[PDB]
């Protein structure tokens, strides 16, 4: 990797103490002295060099002269950004660092450098500087090894990630872990990366597989619990999203899973929903038939290739009878019915 | 409402022959809310700026907002300081309903920079006006651009939205309509925007309730369905919802194997797939894999089952095309819609 200072050369460069460029270049000690001079920054072409080189021998750089800058369009706003946005675009800096040495030059440039660096969503440093050719280049106030380095970098989020974060966040809170996941995998290194990713990752993987997610692998009463929880929220979570045709499947599963669970106990089996429906009466069932009814009104009603509109309610009304249904047959908890709410709350706040 | 948050700089109106940034910019884009945050120096020309503004032309005098806090002359040349000072100013009136211009010309250059910084970083726009006390009427009357016909050198340049766009692209390119939708939903107005959304929405809506997308509605009535369901199943596999495939495939075969014996011999004898498997010695060798997926209890799918979710897809795929001639002109619908969509977004 090498360091390229994609920095211009205004009135300040190169000159008791040196100029932002001199300092900028001198302090960061790079391997690419990118210089995009302008109409006035012609003159300084001559000495600017003599400065950069003559600072210290046996420390030789790349001094690449930039399309001269536009003696008129060097105080033009959007132009400044357009030129520079290109200038940055030129040397993409795949595996090197850009020294956006935007401390010196014409206002527009300075502003523009910043907006570039600050915008520029990747590893590229934006920088500032706080305030006889060979003659001056001898008595330079920072012409030694151990000098007061006034160079101080920006150290921002890049703001690229900002949108990324926000935009990925809104999905996690939107209940869309798949969305969130992808968002996140784009996101460049960040502490709470692992915890966001790893978390999202475990949630993702688990859901698809049809296992308990190995996060909500809580101390439940065997598979029947974990799975019974895992499903119970697979449908809930699901219903949260969109898949209003997922419900039917999930429910009709559980509607059975538990249906067979209770039947397995009361009147030990001793052998569809109509198998439930019939079994309900004769086999120590009465109150369960009321419960299991609407549940079994949806599954039969659901059944062509059309989709009713009262079903959009029947789904809802199905859920309460499926939530309520499970609470009875198994005594879970609202503390353990927040699995993902927690996940989201730990998650969201881990994002922040 | 169009409300420009303009600085109150020294070269205000009375800035030579032509009109002066503030008043200049203001006229050009005729705003309804002439937002002005005036600092210590510019505090003098507080009244004048009112005269010129209003005296620019009648039947177009907006309610101007004198900035709530006086600007301090310690933040004149103030670099980042003004950036903050700006940062808050913008935040004060988010007015996502309305739109804003950040007058490039304003006053101290730092405040300028900030005004830019504010605008670049992130609904409201801004453009400066390229170059050429107590005058009052003297200034206004003999104004060099003080007449309806004037040269509009106030020309502004034209990021986050772009980034969001691409962000939302990939989702469409991943075949995630909900995603794409979302990132669109928030997105602002654009030329393709309507269509990119409109279709997206119709496809989500179309996929939502058991019906067939507007586009996909081009075959007979049912054939639309028999097929318009399939691509459902195909879209499924795309985004790893393996769980959905089984019941789609299942519903698929039988919706067809039945709608195939409807005419090839009405028969009576829910009609389970086990029933169809009995009722065509040749057919009963092609729909074997679909009957292989017949045989869970809250349990998961072993590594192998994900294969079955595939051989069956080849079972149902070839099953679709065989019994109904459709052609790869159909089962590219979404392959195209991607390309239409993506082309569109461009």
Numbering used by the authors:
A (entry chain A): 0 to 14, 17 to 67, 69 to 133, 149 to 288, 301 to 332, 338 to 386
B (entry chain B): 1 to 122, 125 to 134, 147 to 172, 176 to 235, 238 to 288, 299 to 308, 314 to 329, 336 to 386
Original authors' sentences:
Csm6 ribonucleases bind cOA using a CARF (CRISPR-associated Rossmann Fold) domain, resulting in activation of a fused HEPN (Higher Eukaryotes and Prokaryotes Nucleotide binding) ribonuclease domain. Here we characterised the cyclic hexa-adenylate (cA6) activated Csm6’ ribonuclease from the industrially important bacterium Streptococcus thermophilus. StCsm6’ is symmetrical dimer, with each monomer displaying a CARF domain (residues 1–173), a central 6H domain (residues 174–239), and a HEPN domain (residues 240–386). In the dimer, each domain interacts with the equivalent domain in the other monomer, but they cross over each other at the 6H domains to give an ‘X’ arrangement.
Apo StCsm6’ proved to be extremely difficult to crystallize, and only a single crystal in a dehydrated drop of mother liquor following ∼1 year of incubation was obtained. Nevertheless, data on this crystal were collected to 3.54 Å resolution, and the structure solved by molecular replacement with the separate HEPN and CARF domains of the StCsm6’ complex structure used as the search models. Aside from a couple of disordered regions, the peptide backbone of apo StCsm6’ could be built with confidence, but far fewer side chains were modelled due to the low resolution of the data. The structure revealed that apo StCsm6’, like in the complex with cA6, is a symmetrical dimer in an ‘X’ arrangement. Strikingly, however, the overall structure for apo StCsm6’ and in complex with cA6 were markedly different, with an RMSD of 7.7 Å over 327 Cα atoms for the monomer and 4.9 Å over 441 Cα atoms for the dimer (however, there are 386 residues in the monomer and 772 residues in the dimer, meaning the RMSDs over the full length dimeric protein would be much higher). The monomeric form of the individual CARF, 6H and HEPN domains of StCsm6’ are very similar in the apo structure and in complex with cA6, with RMSD values of 1.4 Å or lower over the entirety of each domain. The only difference to note is that one of the loops in the CARF domain (residues 133–149), which encloses the active site in the complex with cA6, could not be modelled in the apo structure, presumably due to conformational flexibility in this region which may not be stabilized until cA6 is bound. Unfortunately, a number of the active site residues could not be modelled in the apo StCsm6’ structure; this could reflect the flexibility in this region prior to cA6 binding which forms the functional active site, but also could be a consequence of the lower resolution data. In the apo StCsm6’ structure, D80 sits in a solvent exposed position in the CARF domain, but upon binding of cA6 the rotation of the CARF domain brings D80 into close contact with the residues at the top of the 6H domain (residues 172–175). One caveat is that the EiCsm6 structure may have been influenced by the presence of a non-hydrolysable cA6 mimic bound to the CARF domains.
